[PDB]
Each structure stands twice: as structure tokens, then as C-alpha cells.
Amino acid sequence: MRPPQFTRAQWFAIQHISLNPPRCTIAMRAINNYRWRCKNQNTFLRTTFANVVNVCGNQSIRCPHNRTLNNCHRSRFRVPLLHCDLINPGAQNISNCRYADRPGRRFYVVACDNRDPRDSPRYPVVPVHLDTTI
Ligand SMILES: Nc1ncnc2c1ncn2[C@@H]1O[C@H](COP(=O)(O)O)[C@@H](O)[C@H]1OP(=O)(O)O
């Protein structure tokens, strides 16, 4: 459940965009604050919001994880990433979750939609979901 105070685009940036992320255990705290249980896995794309918006404006394709949607877009280049892996599953409380940091590099596929009235008018079309990385 995305917290109502944030638009889909804002929650996407909070969960998946970070050029220079801190350790996973630290970065994930803000995200787990709004959940019932700690997130098992989360990926941060080391790029800028502006760059993802550009990927939105390219060739459209069916979303791999949900082919009924023809609103996905694949990046042209592989981008560095930071995978955050949960260490204590079901174990420790949602207050003391620790993560392992794991670097990676690949293409990403995002679903994009029309901006929310609360979003910046500068970007008519914005990224709202990370479908997968290849
Ligand atoms: N509207 C949506 N469309 C597609 N995937 C979604 C949507 N809402 C949540 N998800 C994805 O479902 C999974 C489980 O959601 P949750 O843990 O909140 O229940 C996550 O990978 C999440 O993506 P995301 O990682 O961006 O949150």
C-alpha cells in the first residue's frame, strides 16, 4: 500500500531512484515505516528522475509481468543498480530490519502514466512502477 500523501510518481522516486544511496539498512527505514512487515527486496536505480522520464517517451511495449498493459518502456542502456536484500525474514520486528547491499548492472523496464495533478506540470508523463530489470 502506497501512503496516500504521495503520488505514484513520488513514491516511485522514493523507492527506486538514488544516484548515491547510503547503506541499504539506512535507506530502507523510510520505506518500511509505512509497511506492516519489512520489504523483502528493493532495487535502487543509480540515475536521475529526469533520465527515467526520457525512457518513458520511447517505444512502448507490453509489460513483462503483466502483458495486458501496453504502457512499459525499456532503457536503451544498462544502468548501475543497488539491490537491497532482507536478512531477517519474518524474524526480527519491522523496527529492526537489516539488509545486505548488492551491486548490479542492467537494463530496466518501467511503466509510465499521465501525471497526477499534484505532480510537477513540467513532466506530462511520469514513471509509476518498476516492472523488472534484465
Ligand atoms: N499498482 C501496482 N501495479 C503493479 N505493481 C504494483 C502495484 N502496487 C504495488 N505493486 C508491486 O507489488 C509488489 C508488492 O507490493 P506490496 O509489498 O506493497 O504489497 C511490489 O513489487 C510492488 O512494487 P514496488 O516495489 O514498487 O512497491
Short mmCIF file of all heavy atoms in Angstrom, two decimals, residues 8-19 43-59 71-81 106-113 123-133:
data_model
loop_
_atom_site.label_atom_id
_atom_site.label_comp_id
_atom_site.label_asym_id
_atom_site.label_seq_id
_atom_site.Cartn_x
_atom_site.Cartn_y
_atom_site.Cartn_z
N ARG A 8 1.86 8.49 -7.21
CA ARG A 8 2.53 7.28 -7.68
C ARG A 8 3.97 7.59 -8.11
O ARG A 8 4.88 6.82 -7.84
CB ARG A 8 1.75 6.64 -8.83
CG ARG A 8 0.45 5.96 -8.40
CD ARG A 8 -0.17 5.14 -9.54
NE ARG A 8 -0.54 5.97 -10.68
CZ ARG A 8 -0.91 5.52 -11.87
NH1 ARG A 8 -0.97 4.21 -12.11
NH2 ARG A 8 -1.22 6.38 -12.83
N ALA A 9 4.17 8.72 -8.78
CA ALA A 9 5.49 9.13 -9.24
C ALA A 9 6.44 9.44 -8.09
O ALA A 9 7.63 9.11 -8.13
CB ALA A 9 5.37 10.34 -10.15
N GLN A 10 5.93 10.10 -7.05
CA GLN A 10 6.75 10.44 -5.90
C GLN A 10 7.18 9.19 -5.13
O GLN A 10 8.32 9.08 -4.69
CB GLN A 10 6.00 11.40 -4.97
CG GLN A 10 5.58 12.70 -5.63
CD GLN A 10 4.88 13.66 -4.68
OE1 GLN A 10 3.93 13.29 -3.99
NE2 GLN A 10 5.36 14.90 -4.64
N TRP A 11 6.26 8.24 -4.97
CA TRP A 11 6.57 7.01 -4.26
C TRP A 11 7.58 6.17 -5.06
O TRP A 11 8.40 5.45 -4.49
CB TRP A 11 5.28 6.21 -4.02
CG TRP A 11 5.40 5.06 -3.05
CD1 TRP A 11 5.03 3.77 -3.27
CD2 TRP A 11 5.91 5.11 -1.71
NE1 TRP A 11 5.27 3.01 -2.15
CE2 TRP A 11 5.82 3.80 -1.18
CE3 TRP A 11 6.44 6.12 -0.90
CZ2 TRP A 11 6.23 3.48 0.12
CZ3 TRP A 11 6.85 5.81 0.40
CH2 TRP A 11 6.74 4.50 0.89
N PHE A 12 7.51 6.27 -6.39
CA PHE A 12 8.44 5.55 -7.27
C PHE A 12 9.85 6.08 -7.05
O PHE A 12 10.80 5.31 -6.90
CB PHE A 12 8.06 5.75 -8.75
CG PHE A 12 9.07 5.17 -9.73
CD1 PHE A 12 9.06 3.80 -10.03
CD2 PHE A 12 10.04 5.98 -10.31
CE1 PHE A 12 10.01 3.26 -10.90
CE2 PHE A 12 11.00 5.45 -11.18
CZ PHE A 12 10.98 4.08 -11.48
N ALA A 13 9.99 7.41 -7.03
CA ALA A 13 11.30 8.04 -6.83
C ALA A 13 11.86 7.69 -5.44
O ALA A 13 13.05 7.41 -5.30
CB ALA A 13 11.19 9.55 -6.98
N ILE A 14 11.00 7.73 -4.43
CA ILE A 14 11.40 7.42 -3.06
C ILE A 14 11.91 5.97 -2.97
O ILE A 14 12.95 5.70 -2.36
CB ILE A 14 10.21 7.63 -2.08
CG1 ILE A 14 9.92 9.13 -1.93
CG2 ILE A 14 10.52 7.02 -0.72
CD1 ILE A 14 8.66 9.43 -1.11
N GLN A 15 11.19 5.04 -3.59
CA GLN A 15 11.58 3.63 -3.53
C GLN A 15 12.65 3.18 -4.52
O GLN A 15 13.41 2.26 -4.22
CB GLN A 15 10.37 2.72 -3.77
CG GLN A 15 9.26 2.74 -2.74
CD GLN A 15 8.45 1.45 -2.76
OE1 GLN A 15 8.54 0.63 -1.84
NE2 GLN A 15 7.66 1.26 -3.81
N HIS A 16 12.73 3.81 -5.69
CA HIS A 16 13.66 3.32 -6.71
C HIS A 16 14.68 4.25 -7.38
O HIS A 16 15.40 3.80 -8.27
CB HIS A 16 12.85 2.64 -7.83
CG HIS A 16 11.90 1.59 -7.35
ND1 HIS A 16 12.32 0.40 -6.79
CD2 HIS A 16 10.55 1.54 -7.36
CE1 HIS A 16 11.27 -0.33 -6.46
NE2 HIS A 16 10.18 0.34 -6.80
N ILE A 17 14.75 5.52 -6.99
CA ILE A 17 15.73 6.40 -7.63
C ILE A 17 16.73 6.98 -6.64
O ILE A 17 16.34 7.66 -5.69
CB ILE A 17 15.06 7.61 -8.34
CG1 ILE A 17 14.07 7.15 -9.40
CG2 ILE A 17 16.15 8.49 -8.97
CD1 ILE A 17 14.71 6.62 -10.65
N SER A 18 18.01 6.72 -6.85
CA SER A 18 19.05 7.27 -5.98
C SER A 18 20.42 7.16 -6.63
O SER A 18 20.96 6.07 -6.81
CB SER A 18 19.07 6.55 -4.63
OG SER A 18 20.05 7.11 -3.77
N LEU A 19 20.99 8.31 -6.97
CA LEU A 19 22.30 8.37 -7.62
C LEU A 19 23.43 7.86 -6.71
O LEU A 19 24.30 7.10 -7.15
CB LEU A 19 22.59 9.81 -8.05
CG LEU A 19 23.66 10.02 -9.13
CD1 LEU A 19 23.28 9.26 -10.40
CD2 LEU A 19 23.77 11.51 -9.43
N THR A 43 15.12 -2.53 -5.15
CA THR A 43 16.19 -2.12 -6.07
C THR A 43 16.21 -0.61 -6.32
O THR A 43 15.17 -0.01 -6.58
CB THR A 43 16.03 -2.84 -7.44
OG1 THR A 43 16.18 -4.26 -7.26
CG2 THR A 43 17.09 -2.35 -8.44
N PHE A 44 17.39 -0.02 -6.21
CA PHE A 44 17.57 1.41 -6.47
C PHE A 44 18.33 1.58 -7.78
O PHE A 44 19.38 0.98 -7.97
CB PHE A 44 18.40 2.08 -5.35
CG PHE A 44 17.63 2.35 -4.09
CD1 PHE A 44 17.80 1.54 -2.97
CD2 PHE A 44 16.71 3.40 -4.03
CE1 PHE A 44 17.06 1.77 -1.80
CE2 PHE A 44 15.97 3.64 -2.87
CZ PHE A 44 16.15 2.81 -1.75
N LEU A 45 17.77 2.39 -8.69
CA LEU A 45 18.43 2.66 -9.97
C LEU A 45 19.34 3.86 -9.72
O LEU A 45 18.89 4.89 -9.21
CB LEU A 45 17.40 3.04 -11.05
CG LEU A 45 16.26 2.06 -11.35
CD1 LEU A 45 15.38 2.64 -12.45
CD2 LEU A 45 16.82 0.71 -11.79
N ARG A 46 20.62 3.74 -10.05
CA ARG A 46 21.54 4.84 -9.85
C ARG A 46 21.51 5.75 -11.08
O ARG A 46 22.38 5.68 -11.95
CB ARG A 46 22.96 4.32 -9.56
CG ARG A 46 23.02 3.50 -8.26
CD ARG A 46 24.44 3.14 -7.82
NE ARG A 46 25.17 4.31 -7.35
CZ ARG A 46 26.37 4.27 -6.76
NH1 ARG A 46 26.98 3.11 -6.58
NH2 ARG A 46 26.94 5.39 -6.36
N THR A 47 20.48 6.59 -11.14
CA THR A 47 20.28 7.54 -12.24
C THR A 47 19.47 8.72 -11.71
O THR A 47 19.30 8.87 -10.50
CB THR A 47 19.54 6.86 -13.42
OG1 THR A 47 19.43 7.78 -14.51
CG2 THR A 47 18.14 6.41 -12.99
N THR A 48 18.97 9.57 -12.60
CA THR A 48 18.18 10.74 -12.17
C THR A 48 16.73 10.60 -12.62
O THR A 48 16.45 9.91 -13.60
CB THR A 48 18.74 12.05 -12.78
OG1 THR A 48 18.57 12.02 -14.20
CG2 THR A 48 20.22 12.20 -12.45
N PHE A 49 15.81 11.26 -11.92
CA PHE A 49 14.39 11.20 -12.27
C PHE A 49 14.20 11.64 -13.73
O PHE A 49 13.43 11.04 -14.48
CB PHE A 49 13.56 12.09 -11.35
CG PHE A 49 12.07 11.94 -11.53
CD1 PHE A 49 11.37 10.91 -10.90
CD2 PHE A 49 11.36 12.81 -12.36
CE1 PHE A 49 9.99 10.75 -11.09
CE2 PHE A 49 9.98 12.66 -12.56
CZ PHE A 49 9.29 11.63 -11.92
N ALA A 50 14.92 12.69 -14.12
CA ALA A 50 14.84 13.23 -15.47
C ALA A 50 15.18 12.20 -16.54
O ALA A 50 14.56 12.18 -17.60
CB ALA A 50 15.77 14.44 -15.61
N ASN A 51 16.17 11.35 -16.27
CA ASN A 51 16.58 10.32 -17.22
C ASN A 51 15.53 9.23 -17.39
O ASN A 51 15.36 8.68 -18.48
CB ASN A 51 17.91 9.69 -16.79
CG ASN A 51 19.09 10.64 -16.96
OD1 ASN A 51 20.20 10.36 -16.51
ND2 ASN A 51 18.86 11.76 -17.63
N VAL A 52 14.82 8.90 -16.32
CA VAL A 52 13.78 7.87 -16.40
C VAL A 52 12.59 8.42 -17.20
O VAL A 52 11.98 7.70 -18.00
CB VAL A 52 13.31 7.46 -14.98
CG1 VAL A 52 12.27 6.34 -15.07
CG2 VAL A 52 14.51 7.00 -14.16
N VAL A 53 12.28 9.70 -17.00
CA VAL A 53 11.19 10.35 -17.73
C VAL A 53 11.42 10.25 -19.24
O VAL A 53 10.47 10.10 -20.00
CB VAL A 53 11.08 11.84 -17.33
CG1 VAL A 53 10.08 12.56 -18.24
CG2 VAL A 53 10.64 11.97 -15.88
N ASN A 54 12.68 10.33 -19.66
CA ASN A 54 13.03 10.24 -21.08
C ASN A 54 12.77 8.84 -21.61
O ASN A 54 12.35 8.67 -22.75
CB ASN A 54 14.50 10.60 -21.31
CG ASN A 54 14.75 12.09 -21.28
OD1 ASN A 54 14.11 12.85 -22.02
ND2 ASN A 54 15.69 12.53 -20.44
N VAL A 55 13.05 7.85 -20.78
CA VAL A 55 12.83 6.46 -21.16
C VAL A 55 11.33 6.28 -21.41
O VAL A 55 10.93 5.48 -22.26
CB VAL A 55 13.29 5.50 -20.05
CG1 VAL A 55 12.94 4.07 -20.42
CG2 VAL A 55 14.79 5.63 -19.84
N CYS A 56 10.52 7.01 -20.66
CA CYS A 56 9.07 6.93 -20.79
C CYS A 56 8.63 7.35 -22.20
O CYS A 56 7.71 6.77 -22.77
CB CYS A 56 8.38 7.84 -19.77
SG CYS A 56 8.31 7.23 -18.05
N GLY A 57 9.30 8.36 -22.74
CA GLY A 57 8.97 8.86 -24.06
C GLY A 57 9.39 8.02 -25.26
O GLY A 57 9.24 8.47 -26.39
N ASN A 58 9.92 6.82 -25.03
CA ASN A 58 10.34 6.00 -26.16
C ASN A 58 9.34 4.91 -26.54
O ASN A 58 8.19 4.92 -26.10
CB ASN A 58 11.72 5.38 -25.89
CG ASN A 58 11.67 4.21 -24.92
OD1 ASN A 58 12.71 3.64 -24.58
ND2 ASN A 58 10.48 3.83 -24.49
N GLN A 59 9.80 3.97 -27.37
CA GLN A 59 8.98 2.86 -27.84
C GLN A 59 8.21 2.19 -26.71
O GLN A 59 8.78 1.86 -25.67
CB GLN A 59 9.87 1.82 -28.53
CG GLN A 59 9.54 1.57 -30.00
CD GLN A 59 8.18 0.93 -30.20
OE1 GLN A 59 7.93 -0.18 -29.73
NE2 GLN A 59 7.29 1.64 -30.90
N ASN A 71 1.95 -0.23 -21.53
CA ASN A 71 2.46 1.06 -21.08
C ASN A 71 3.89 1.00 -20.52
O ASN A 71 4.28 1.87 -19.75
CB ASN A 71 1.54 1.62 -19.99
CG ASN A 71 0.09 1.67 -20.42
OD1 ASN A 71 -0.30 2.52 -21.22
ND2 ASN A 71 -0.71 0.75 -19.90
N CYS A 72 4.65 -0.02 -20.90
CA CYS A 72 6.01 -0.17 -20.42
C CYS A 72 7.07 0.31 -21.41
O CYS A 72 6.83 0.38 -22.62
CB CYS A 72 6.27 -1.62 -20.00
SG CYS A 72 5.71 -1.94 -18.29
N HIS A 73 8.25 0.66 -20.88
CA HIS A 73 9.35 1.17 -21.69
C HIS A 73 10.69 0.66 -21.15
O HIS A 73 10.96 0.75 -19.95
CB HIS A 73 9.35 2.70 -21.64
CG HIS A 73 8.04 3.31 -22.01
ND1 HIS A 73 7.67 3.56 -23.32
CD2 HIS A 73 6.99 3.71 -21.25
CE1 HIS A 73 6.46 4.09 -23.34
NE2 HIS A 73 6.03 4.19 -22.10
N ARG A 74 11.54 0.14 -22.04
CA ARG A 74 12.85 -0.37 -21.64
C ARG A 74 13.95 0.66 -21.89
O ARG A 74 13.91 1.37 -22.89
CB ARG A 74 13.18 -1.65 -22.41
CG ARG A 74 14.17 -2.54 -21.68
CD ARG A 74 14.87 -3.49 -22.62
NE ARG A 74 15.74 -2.76 -23.54
CZ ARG A 74 16.75 -3.30 -24.20
NH1 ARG A 74 17.04 -4.58 -24.05
NH2 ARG A 74 17.48 -2.55 -25.02
N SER A 75 14.91 0.75 -20.98
CA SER A 75 16.01 1.70 -21.16
C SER A 75 16.88 1.22 -22.31
O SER A 75 16.95 0.02 -22.60
CB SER A 75 16.86 1.80 -19.88
OG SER A 75 17.48 0.57 -19.57
N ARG A 76 17.55 2.14 -22.98
CA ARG A 76 18.41 1.78 -24.10
C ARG A 76 19.76 1.26 -23.61
O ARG A 76 20.38 0.42 -24.26
CB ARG A 76 18.63 2.97 -25.03
CG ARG A 76 19.21 4.20 -24.35
CD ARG A 76 19.67 5.25 -25.36
NE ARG A 76 18.62 5.64 -26.29
CZ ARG A 76 18.28 4.96 -27.39
NH1 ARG A 76 18.91 3.83 -27.70
NH2 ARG A 76 17.30 5.40 -28.17
N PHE A 77 20.20 1.76 -22.46
CA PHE A 77 21.49 1.36 -21.88
C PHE A 77 21.35 0.68 -20.51
O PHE A 77 20.35 0.86 -19.81
CB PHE A 77 22.38 2.60 -21.71
CG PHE A 77 22.86 3.18 -23.01
CD1 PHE A 77 23.35 4.49 -23.06
CD2 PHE A 77 22.86 2.42 -24.18
CE1 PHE A 77 23.81 5.03 -24.26
CE2 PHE A 77 23.32 2.96 -25.38
CZ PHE A 77 23.80 4.27 -25.42
N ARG A 78 22.36 -0.10 -20.15
CA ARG A 78 22.36 -0.77 -18.86
C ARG A 78 22.77 0.30 -17.84
O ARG A 78 23.63 1.13 -18.13
CB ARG A 78 23.36 -1.93 -18.85
CG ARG A 78 22.82 -3.20 -19.49
CD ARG A 78 23.85 -4.33 -19.46
NE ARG A 78 24.73 -4.29 -20.63
CZ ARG A 78 24.45 -4.88 -21.79
NH1 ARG A 78 23.33 -5.56 -21.95
NH2 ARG A 78 25.31 -4.77 -22.81
N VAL A 79 22.14 0.29 -16.67
CA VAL A 79 22.43 1.29 -15.65
C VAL A 79 22.89 0.63 -14.35
O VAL A 79 22.43 -0.47 -14.03
CB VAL A 79 21.17 2.16 -15.37
CG1 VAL A 79 20.11 1.33 -14.68
CG2 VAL A 79 21.52 3.36 -14.52
N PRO A 80 23.82 1.26 -13.62
CA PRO A 80 24.27 0.65 -12.36
C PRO A 80 23.11 0.64 -11.36
O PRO A 80 22.28 1.56 -11.34
CB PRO A 80 25.44 1.55 -11.92
CG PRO A 80 25.23 2.84 -12.67
CD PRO A 80 24.68 2.39 -14.00
N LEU A 81 23.05 -0.40 -10.54
CA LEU A 81 21.97 -0.56 -9.56
C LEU A 81 22.48 -1.00 -8.19
O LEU A 81 23.60 -1.50 -8.05
CB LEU A 81 21.00 -1.66 -10.01
CG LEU A 81 20.64 -1.89 -11.47
CD1 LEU A 81 19.96 -3.24 -11.60
CD2 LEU A 81 19.74 -0.78 -11.96
N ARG A 106 22.15 -3.46 -15.21
CA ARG A 106 21.31 -3.95 -16.29
C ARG A 106 20.31 -2.94 -16.81
O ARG A 106 20.24 -1.80 -16.34
CB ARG A 106 20.59 -5.22 -15.85
CG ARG A 106 20.10 -5.22 -14.43
CD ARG A 106 19.78 -6.65 -14.03
NE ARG A 106 20.89 -7.52 -14.40
CZ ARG A 106 20.95 -8.83 -14.13
NH1 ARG A 106 19.95 -9.42 -13.48
NH2 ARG A 106 22.01 -9.54 -14.50
N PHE A 107 19.54 -3.38 -17.80
CA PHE A 107 18.50 -2.56 -18.40
C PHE A 107 17.34 -2.58 -17.42
O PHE A 107 17.22 -3.51 -16.62
CB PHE A 107 18.01 -3.18 -19.72
CG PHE A 107 19.04 -3.21 -20.82
CD1 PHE A 107 19.61 -4.42 -21.22
CD2 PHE A 107 19.42 -2.04 -21.47
CE1 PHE A 107 20.55 -4.46 -22.27
CE2 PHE A 107 20.35 -2.07 -22.52
CZ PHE A 107 20.91 -3.29 -22.91
N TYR A 108 16.48 -1.58 -17.46
CA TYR A 108 15.32 -1.61 -16.59
C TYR A 108 14.09 -1.34 -17.44
O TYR A 108 14.20 -0.75 -18.51
CB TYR A 108 15.42 -0.58 -15.45
CG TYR A 108 15.52 0.86 -15.88
CD1 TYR A 108 14.38 1.61 -16.13
CD2 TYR A 108 16.77 1.49 -16.01
CE1 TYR A 108 14.46 2.95 -16.50
CE2 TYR A 108 16.86 2.82 -16.38
CZ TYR A 108 15.71 3.55 -16.62
OH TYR A 108 15.80 4.87 -16.98
N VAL A 109 12.94 -1.80 -16.96
CA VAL A 109 11.68 -1.59 -17.67
C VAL A 109 10.70 -0.94 -16.71
O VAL A 109 10.37 -1.52 -15.67
CB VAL A 109 11.08 -2.92 -18.16
CG1 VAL A 109 9.79 -2.66 -18.94
CG2 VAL A 109 12.09 -3.67 -19.02
N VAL A 110 10.24 0.26 -17.05
CA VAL A 110 9.29 0.99 -16.20
C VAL A 110 7.96 1.20 -16.89
O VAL A 110 7.90 1.27 -18.12
CB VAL A 110 9.83 2.40 -15.78
CG1 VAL A 110 11.06 2.25 -14.89
CG2 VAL A 110 10.17 3.23 -17.03
N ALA A 111 6.89 1.28 -16.11
CA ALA A 111 5.56 1.55 -16.65
C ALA A 111 5.38 3.04 -16.40
O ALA A 111 5.71 3.52 -15.31
CB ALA A 111 4.48 0.75 -15.91
N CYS A 112 4.88 3.77 -17.38
CA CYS A 112 4.68 5.21 -17.23
C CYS A 112 3.22 5.57 -17.47
O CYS A 112 2.54 4.91 -18.26
CB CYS A 112 5.56 5.96 -18.22
SG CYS A 112 7.32 5.46 -18.22
N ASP A 113 2.74 6.62 -16.81
CA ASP A 113 1.35 7.05 -16.96
C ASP A 113 1.28 8.57 -16.91
O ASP A 113 2.28 9.25 -16.70
CB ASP A 113 0.52 6.44 -15.82
CG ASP A 113 -0.97 6.38 -16.13
OD1 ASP A 113 -1.37 6.70 -17.27
OD2 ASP A 113 -1.73 5.99 -15.22
N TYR A 123 6.52 17.64 -16.29
CA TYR A 123 6.50 16.31 -16.88
C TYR A 123 5.09 15.76 -17.03
O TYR A 123 4.49 15.31 -16.05
CB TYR A 123 7.34 15.35 -16.03
CG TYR A 123 8.77 15.80 -15.84
CD1 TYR A 123 9.29 16.02 -14.57
CD2 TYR A 123 9.61 15.99 -16.94
CE1 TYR A 123 10.61 16.41 -14.39
CE2 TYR A 123 10.93 16.39 -16.78
CZ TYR A 123 11.42 16.60 -15.50
OH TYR A 123 12.73 16.98 -15.33
N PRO A 124 4.55 15.78 -18.25
CA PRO A 124 3.20 15.28 -18.53
C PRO A 124 3.08 13.77 -18.31
O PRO A 124 2.05 13.29 -17.85
CB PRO A 124 2.99 15.67 -19.99
CG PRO A 124 4.37 15.63 -20.56
CD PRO A 124 5.17 16.31 -19.48
N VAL A 125 4.15 13.04 -18.65
CA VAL A 125 4.18 11.59 -18.49
C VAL A 125 5.31 11.22 -17.52
O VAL A 125 6.45 11.63 -17.71
CB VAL A 125 4.41 10.88 -19.83
CG1 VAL A 125 4.33 9.37 -19.64
CG2 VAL A 125 3.36 11.33 -20.84
N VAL A 126 4.98 10.44 -16.50
CA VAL A 126 5.95 10.05 -15.48
C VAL A 126 5.99 8.55 -15.18
O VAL A 126 5.04 7.82 -15.47
CB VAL A 126 5.66 10.81 -14.16
CG1 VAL A 126 5.96 12.30 -14.33
CG2 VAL A 126 4.20 10.63 -13.76
N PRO A 127 7.11 8.06 -14.60
CA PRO A 127 7.26 6.64 -14.25
C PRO A 127 6.49 6.34 -12.96
O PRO A 127 6.54 7.12 -12.01
CB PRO A 127 8.77 6.49 -14.06
CG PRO A 127 9.16 7.82 -13.47
CD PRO A 127 8.37 8.80 -14.34
N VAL A 128 5.76 5.23 -12.93
CA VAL A 128 4.98 4.89 -11.74
C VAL A 128 5.25 3.49 -11.17
O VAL A 128 4.80 3.18 -10.07
CB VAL A 128 3.46 5.02 -12.01
CG1 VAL A 128 3.11 6.48 -12.31
CG2 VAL A 128 3.04 4.13 -13.18
N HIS A 129 5.97 2.66 -11.91
CA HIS A 129 6.26 1.31 -11.45
C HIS A 129 7.47 0.68 -12.15
O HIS A 129 7.66 0.87 -13.35
CB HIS A 129 5.02 0.43 -11.69
CG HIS A 129 5.20 -0.99 -11.26
ND1 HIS A 129 5.41 -1.35 -9.94
CD2 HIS A 129 5.21 -2.15 -11.97
CE1 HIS A 129 5.55 -2.67 -9.87
NE2 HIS A 129 5.43 -3.17 -11.08
N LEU A 130 8.29 -0.04 -11.38
CA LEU A 130 9.47 -0.72 -11.91
C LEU A 130 9.03 -2.16 -12.21
O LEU A 130 8.83 -2.96 -11.30
CB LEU A 130 10.60 -0.72 -10.86
CG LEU A 130 11.89 -1.45 -11.26
CD1 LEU A 130 12.45 -0.84 -12.54
CD2 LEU A 130 12.92 -1.37 -10.12
N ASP A 131 8.86 -2.49 -13.49
CA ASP A 131 8.40 -3.83 -13.85
C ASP A 131 9.46 -4.89 -13.65
O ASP A 131 9.19 -5.94 -13.07
CB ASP A 131 7.91 -3.86 -15.31
CG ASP A 131 7.26 -5.19 -15.67
OD1 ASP A 131 7.97 -6.22 -15.70
OD2 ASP A 131 6.04 -5.21 -15.92
N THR A 132 10.67 -4.63 -14.13
CA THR A 132 11.74 -5.59 -13.99
C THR A 132 13.06 -5.04 -14.52
O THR A 132 13.09 -3.97 -15.13
CB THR A 132 11.42 -6.90 -14.75
OG1 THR A 132 12.36 -7.92 -14.39
CG2 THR A 132 11.48 -6.66 -16.25
N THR A 133 14.13 -5.78 -14.28
CA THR A 133 15.46 -5.41 -14.75
C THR A 133 15.96 -6.62 -15.53
O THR A 133 15.66 -7.76 -15.16
CB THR A 133 16.41 -5.13 -13.56
OG1 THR A 133 16.45 -6.28 -12.70
CG2 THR A 133 15.93 -3.92 -12.76
#
